[PDB]
Amino acid sequence: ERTIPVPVDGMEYHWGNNDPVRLWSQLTTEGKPHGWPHQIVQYYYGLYPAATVSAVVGMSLLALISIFASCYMLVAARSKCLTPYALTPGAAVPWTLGILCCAP
Amino acid sequence: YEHSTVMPNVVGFPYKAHIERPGYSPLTLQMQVVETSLEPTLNLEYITCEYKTVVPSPYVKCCGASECSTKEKPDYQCKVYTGVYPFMWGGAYCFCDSENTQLSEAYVDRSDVCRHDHASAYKAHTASLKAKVRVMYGNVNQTVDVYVNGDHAVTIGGTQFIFGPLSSAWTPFDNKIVVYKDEVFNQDFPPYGSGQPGRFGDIQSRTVESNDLYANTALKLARPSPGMVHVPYTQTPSGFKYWLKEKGTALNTKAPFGCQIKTNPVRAMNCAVGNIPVSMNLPDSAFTRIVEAPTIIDLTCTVATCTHSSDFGGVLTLTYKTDKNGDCSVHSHSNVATLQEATAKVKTAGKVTLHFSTASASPSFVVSLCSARATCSASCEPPKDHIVPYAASHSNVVFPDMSGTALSWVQKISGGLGAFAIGAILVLVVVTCIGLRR
Amino acid sequence: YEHSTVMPNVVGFPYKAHIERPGYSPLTLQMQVVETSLEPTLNLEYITCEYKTVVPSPYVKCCGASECSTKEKPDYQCKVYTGVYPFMWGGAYCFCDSENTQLSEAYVDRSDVCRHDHASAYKAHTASLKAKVRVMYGNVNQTVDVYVNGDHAVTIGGTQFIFGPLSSAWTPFDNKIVVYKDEVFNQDFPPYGSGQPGRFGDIQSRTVESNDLYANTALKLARPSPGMVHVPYTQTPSGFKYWLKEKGTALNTKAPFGCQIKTNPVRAMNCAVGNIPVSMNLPDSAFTRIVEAPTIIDLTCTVATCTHSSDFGGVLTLTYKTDKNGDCSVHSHSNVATLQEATAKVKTAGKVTLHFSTASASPSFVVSLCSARATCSASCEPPKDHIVPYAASHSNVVFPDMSGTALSWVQKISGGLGAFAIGAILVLVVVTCIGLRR
Numbered sequence: 001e002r003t004i005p006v007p008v009d010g011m012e013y014h015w016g017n018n019d020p021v022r023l024w025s026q027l028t029t030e031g032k033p034h035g036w037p038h039q040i041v042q043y044y045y046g047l048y049p050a051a052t053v054s055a056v057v058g059m060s061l062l063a064l065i066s067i068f069a070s071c072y073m074l075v076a077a078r079s080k081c082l083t084p085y086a087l088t089p090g091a092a093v094p095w096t097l098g099i100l101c102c103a104p
Numbered sequence: 105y106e107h108s109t110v111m112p113n114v115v116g117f118p119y120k121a122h123i124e125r126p127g128y129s130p131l132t133l134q135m136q137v138v139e140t141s142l143e144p145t146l147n148l149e150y151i152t153c154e155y156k157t158v159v160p161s162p163y164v165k166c167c168g169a170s171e172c173s174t175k176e177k178p179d180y181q182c183k184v185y186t187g188v189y190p191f192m193w194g195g196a197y198c199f200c201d202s203e204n205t206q207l208s209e210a211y212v213d214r215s216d217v218c219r220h221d222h223a224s225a226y227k228a229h230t231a232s233l234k235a236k237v238r239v240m241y242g243n244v245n246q247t248v249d250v251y252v253n254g255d256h257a258v259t260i261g262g263t264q265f266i267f268g269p270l271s272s273a274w275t276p277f278d279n280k281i282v283v284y285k286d287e288v289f290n291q292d293f294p295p296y297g298s299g300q301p302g303r304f305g306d307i308q309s310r311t312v313e314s315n316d317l318y319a320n321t322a323l324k325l326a327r328p329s330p331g332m333v334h335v336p337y338t339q340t341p342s343g344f345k346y347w348l349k350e351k352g353t354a355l356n357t358k359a360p361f362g363c364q365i366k367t368n369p370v371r372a373m374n375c376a377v378g379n380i381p382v383s384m385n386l387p388d389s390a391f392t393r394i395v396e397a398p399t400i401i402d403l404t405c406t407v408a409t410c411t412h413s414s415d416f417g418g419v420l421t422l423t424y425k426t427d428k429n430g431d432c433s434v435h436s437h438s439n440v441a442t443l444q445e446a447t448a449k450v451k452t453a454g455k456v457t458l459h460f461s462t463a464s465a466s467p468s469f470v471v472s473l474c475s476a477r478a479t480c481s482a483s484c485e486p487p488k489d490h491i492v493p494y495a496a497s498h499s500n501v502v503f504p505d506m507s508g509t510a511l512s513w514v515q516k517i518s519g520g521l522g523a524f525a526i527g528a529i530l531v532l533v534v535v536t537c538i539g540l541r542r
Numbered sequence: 543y544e545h546s547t548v549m550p551n552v553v554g555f556p557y558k559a560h561i562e563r564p565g566y567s568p569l570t571l572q573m574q575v576v577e578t579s580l581e582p583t584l585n586l587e588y589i590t591c592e593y594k595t596v597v598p599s600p601y602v603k604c605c606g607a608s609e610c611s612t613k614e615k616p617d618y619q620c621k622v623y624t625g626v627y628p629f630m631w632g633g634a635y636c637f638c639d640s641e642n643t644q645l646s647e648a649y650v651d652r653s654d655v656c657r658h659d660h661a662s663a664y665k666a667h668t669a670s671l672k673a674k675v676r677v678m679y680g681n682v683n684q685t686v687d688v689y690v691n692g693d694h695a696v697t698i699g700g701t702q703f704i705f706g707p708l709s710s711a712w713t714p715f716d717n718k719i720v721v722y723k724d725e726v727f728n729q730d731f732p733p734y735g736s737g738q739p740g741r742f743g744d745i746q747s748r749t750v751e752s753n754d755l756y757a758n759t760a761l762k763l764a765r766p767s768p769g770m771v772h773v774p775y776t777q778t779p780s781g782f783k784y785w786l787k788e789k790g791t792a793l794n795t796k797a798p799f800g801c802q803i804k805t806n807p808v809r810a811m812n813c814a815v816g817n818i819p820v821s822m823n824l825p826d827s828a829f830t831r832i833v834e835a836p837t838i839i840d841l842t843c844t845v846a847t848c849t850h851s852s853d854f855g856g857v858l859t860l861t862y863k864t865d866k867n868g869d870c871s872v873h874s875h876s877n878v879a880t881l882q883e884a885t886a887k888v889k890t891a892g893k894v895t896l897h898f899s900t901a902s903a904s905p906s907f908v909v910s911l912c913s914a915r916a917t918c919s920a921s922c923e924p925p926k927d928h929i930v931p932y933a934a935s936h937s938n939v940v941f942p943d944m945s946g947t948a949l950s951w952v953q954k955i956s957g958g959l960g961a962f963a964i965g966a967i968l969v970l971v972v973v974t975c976i977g978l979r980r
């Protein structure tokens with residue numbers, strides 16, 4: 001018994017004196033391509049592993065950097081708004097401002 | 105009317121080419137490739153066959169001496185041996201006890217079956233292409249043999265077709281090849297006049313009928329045994345048989361792109377690579393004016409079943425309103441999906457059904473019937489089988505439409521994050537502006 | 543022993559090669575080229591020849607009509623005319639005054655002489671080379687036909703020679719050529735199946751013996767004049783004769799590098815371009831031992847007369863002192879001046895004379911006799927003949943030696959200027975140093 005790899009391009013084999021025989025492979029894979037995102041991811045991975053892994057990690061990295069940058073920008077905006085009150089001797093922050101933005 | 109298109113060079117794949125000019129209904133031409141042939145230009149270098157050794161009877165001189173003169177023969181070896189006492193069945197051949205001399209010589213010549221069993225050494229060059237093409241349109245069905253080189257111009261039903269040139273300069277043959285019976289090998293060979301004993305090309309000849317021969321097989325002669333009459337010689341075995349024993353792997357079982365090698369003449373068939381440009385000049389008799397063509401209004405498209413596979417596993421229906429029964433040309437404007445029929449019978453019923461094949465999870469493509477167009481978006485489930493015997497009947501494409509489910513999810517996530525970022529940047533802008541106004 | 547060199551590809555130029563090895567006297571080889579051939583490999587496209595218009599006797603039907611069906615013949619043209627009253631020498635032909643019908647047809651075929659007179663279209667590819675080389679050394683003087691390919695290995699007197707490959711892939715043939723009789727033309731031709739009337743390629747056949755024919759000559763028929771029995775036709779004259787009239791200028795009187803074009807097969811001869819590499823393997827029997835070769839001591843060279851011309855216009859004298867009479871190989875170790883004799887005879891008198899040719903005003907080189915070397919430098923004068931009937935026998939070198947008059951004057955001027963500049967620079971540096979001291 002032997003095992004022969006059949007890619008999507010096809011395989012031709014010759015055995016003895018019969019005519020050579022050709023075989024082709026369809027695009028079958030596990031998972032379902034129209035459900036929750038994990039099912040789609042696993043279907044695509046079954047069809048093409050390396051490209052799908054690369055795409056997923058790139059998407060995750062981009063989402064993470066975007067969200068972290070925007071959160072840091074909002075924090076910096078809060079700090080810039082609230083700093084001039086702390087440098088002022090005495091005085092106080094309006095309660096509306098201290099409720100809208102967390103002011104210790 | 106002049107037109108140009110590009111068709112893939114894969115055998116058995118139907119091609120629909122769309123033609124549309126003002127003042128006439130659109131038309132679709134079915135073009136297919138039945139077989140392709142790729143032949144190189146060969147110039148012979150030498151041929152090789154098995155050898156045979158010609159050794160005549162020795163010349164024994166009793167009570168005397170002899171000397172031999174050089175001849176002009178392939179690998180002529182001669183020697184004179186002194187002090188011999190030959191014997192026979194009756195008795196001593198010579199009366200003199202130790203004054204005899206034996207002259208021996210031998211040479212080599214091509215075998216008596218060299219015309220029927222030999223291997224040829226060829227040098228390959230630029231290769232030309234021939235093809236057989238089936239053309240269908242209207243009431244025209246014909247197969248023609250063409251040269252794909254941009255020169256041949258064929259006429260099918262008064263329509264001029266020019267093919268080629270091929271878009272890839274690829275050949276499987278190396279510069280030097282060797283041909284034997286029904287096999288070609290990409291093996292380099294020794295140059296003429298410089299063969300080596302024991303290996304390929306130990307005897308060389310410019311052609312089968314040539315009267316010259318170059319032989320180098322290390323013929324050596326030996327002194328005859330005492331009390332004996334014979335001629336002993338040592339010589340390396342024939343290099344042709346040695347080559348035949350372990351020639352290697354033939355190019356027939358190693359040629360890429362799954363294309364078949366045949367000999368007499370040397371050629372490679374069905375070599376699937378590249379694409380062929382087609383230039384066409386059509387007469388006005390094959391078109392139909394708008395006046396005698398049906399008018400289609402308010403036509404929309406929907407899909408019934410879609411399972412993307414190498415077969416035609418897809419059915420889509422088209423609804424329309426017309427004014428008279430007739431025939432129309434139907435076509436798909438994208439290569440994501442490929443249709444099967446080219447002409448559709450339109451009737452007053454208002455519904456037609458067509459088959460198609462695709463290879464993406466969610467294909468979106470625009471179809472056209474007569475002068476009207478519509479869009480078709482679908483979702484197709486993968487097949488359950490693993491191996492099929494036939495080849496793919498679709499162009500390979502996998503990228504889904506931007507309105508597909510996965511694309512929809514990524515678009516939603518991106519839009520949410522973009523709105524979040526826009527809000528953050530707007531807040532920063534207003535904060536810094538009010539701060540600077542202070 | 544194995545040696546390698548390069549030799550110019552000029553027909554009739556005597557090349558001298560020097561072989562020097564430890565333990566043996568130097569050897570001088572003479573190599574010359576007598577004829578070079580350059581043949582491109584060709585594939586046929588079609589042939590063209592004058593045509594003939596075949597028209598049969600007209601058909602006349604009295605009181606009846608006829609209709610003619612198309613036939614698969616080259617440019618077949620058939621027509622039917624109504625209302626004819628043909629006349630013959632006896633009188634009228636039919637009672638029906640206006641109920642007769644005439645049927646006329648004509649077509650075009652190849653001439654009966656097309657086999658003996660045709661023009662062929664060819665496509666040119668990479669071209670091989672053939673050469674004939676004469677080699678002299680010692681007592682060996684032989685000519686040999688070789689391929690300048692890097693493949694052929696020839697044996698001459700126990701010595702193995704290999705030529706090629708050429709150092710410049712240049713061919714005087716365009717991609718497409720047309721061959722007729724004994725002339726070749728670098729003209730493009732219309733593609734097969736796309737001939738135009740009145741010019742080259744009005745009729746085309748794939749080969750001389752083929753049966754299919756493609757003709758396009760605008761054979762139009764016209765109605766017969768009243769009271770007549772004939773068939774009138776207007777046809778554009780044959781394009782082959784028209785091409786013959788003003789074909790153009792042949793490549794025979796236009797080919798560059800001064801090489802002659804011959805047909806059957808298509809080839810070029812004596813194309814002076816590039817240089818040929820030579821690889822040789824000599825046996826040890828062709829040399830001479832040092833112990834028997836004369837030893838030369840105290841060798842000096844003087845030049846009596848010099849005149850740089852295409853002839854061997856220069857005489858040099860060598861003085862020496864030996865121990866035994868003999869013959870030794872003499873060579874020039876530079877390129878500016880080329881010698882004529884390869885071997886010279888040395889006697890106890892101690893004076894030999896040699897002839898040489900040069901092209902520089904002040905040639906300086908090294909002359910090697912047997913085993914010793916000396917330097918030769920002289921001054922020459924130009925010749926007086928403006929035009930000569932033989933090719934130059936010297937490699938074209940014009941740059942004078944550094945010891946010549948012109949370069950000597952340049953050196954003197956440069957040295958004076960440099961010394962004066964150095965003096966000025968030294969004075970300034972001294973002044974700035976003494977100033978910086980304070």
Ligand SMILES: *[C@@H]1O[C@H](CO)[C@@H](O[C@@H]2O[C@H](CO)[C@@H](O)[C@H](O)[C@H]2NC(C)=O)[C@H](O)[C@H]1NC(C)=O
Binds near residue numbers: 605638641
């Ligand atoms: C002999 O002549 C007569 C008259 O010239 C021919 O009769 C004519 O036949 C054609 C077709 O058969 C008709 O269209 C005409 O109307 C006929 N003419 C008359 C006056 O009737 C007859 O065909 C001729 N026969 C032969 C054998 O020549």
Ligand SMILES: *[C@@H]1O[C@H](CO)[C@@H](O)[C@H](O)[C@H]1NC(C)=O
Binds near residue numbers: 245
């Ligand atoms: C075209 O001709 C071929 C050859 O006879 C035939 O097999 C094929 O069915 C024809 N096609 C159509 C659509 O009739």
Ligand SMILES: *[C@@H]1O[C@H](CO)[C@@H](O)[C@H](O)[C@H]1NC(C)=O
Binds near residue numbers: 678683684
């Ligand atoms: C070599 O042989 C040819 C053939 O006759 C002759 O013409 C030529 O002069 C010879 N050369 C020498 C150097 O003897």
